[PDB]
C-alpha cells in the first residue's frame, strides 16, 4: 500500500550505501506521489544524478534540486510548485523526510532528511515519509557537510527507484 523508494548514494563517485524510504501516501498522497514519480524518473525528469547540495550536521541533509543543482530550482510533477498538502505528520526524529520550500505553498522537488528532532519546523514543511533502511548511511553523509551547509565532496543520488 505505501510505496517504498530507495537512493544509492555516492561520494564523488565511490558508492556509499542505500537509503530506502517509506512514503506515507495514505496521509500525504499528492506529496508522496511526487517524490515517488521523481525517484522512478517515469515522467522524464528526476533525482537520479542530483546531489545533496546542503548538509548541516545534526540538523538535516537537503537535496533534490535537479534543475539548478544549488537550492534555487527543482520542479514538481504537477508544474514547478504546488500547495502544502497538509501538516498531519510532525518532525519527530531522525529519518523523517520532509519537503523543503521557499515559504508556504511553494513545494517543488527539494526535500530534506532530518538527522535530529526538529520540532521548530512543524507546521511549516510537509512531512511525507521516513527512512526505512539506511540511517547510518544518512549519518555518515553528515561528515561531508558543514555548519552553513556547504558540502566538501559531491554527494549524489547515483541511482534511485521504487522497490515496492
Amino acid at each position: 500500500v505505501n510505496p517504498t523508494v530507495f537512493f544509492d548514494i555516492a561520494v564523488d563517485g565511490e558508492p556509499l550505501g542505500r537509503v530506502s524510504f517509506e512514503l506515507f501516501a495514505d496521509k500525504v498522497p499528492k506529496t508522496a506521489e511526487n517524490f515517488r514519480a521523481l525517484s522512478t524518473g517515469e515522467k522524464g525528469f528526476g533525482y537520479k544524478g542530483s546531489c545533496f547540495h546542503r548538509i548541516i550536521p545534526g540538523f538535516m541533509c537537503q537535496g533534490g534540486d535537479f534543475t539548478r543543482h544549488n537550492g534555487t530550482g527543482g520542479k514538481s510533477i504537477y508544474g514547478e510548485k504546488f500547495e502544502d498538502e497538509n501538516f498531519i505528520l510532525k518532525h519527530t526524529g531522525p529519518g523523517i523526510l520532509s519537503m523543503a520550500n521557499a515559504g508556504p505553498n511553494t513545494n517543488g522537488s527539494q526535500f530534506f532528511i532530518c538527522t535530529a528532532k526538529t520540532e521548530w519546523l512543524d507546521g511549516k514543511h510537509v512531512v511525507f515519509g521516513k527512512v526505512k533502511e539506511g540511517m547510518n548511511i544518512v549519518e555518515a553523509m553528515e561528515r561531508f557537510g558543514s555548519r552553513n551547509g556547504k558540502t566538501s565532496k559531491k554527494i549524489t543520488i547515483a541511482d534511485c527507484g521504487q522497490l515496492e
Binding site: 538535516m60 537550492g71 521557499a102 530534506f112
Partner: peptide
Amino acid sequence: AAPF
C-alpha cells in the same frame, strides 16, 4: 532555502 527553508528549512531555516
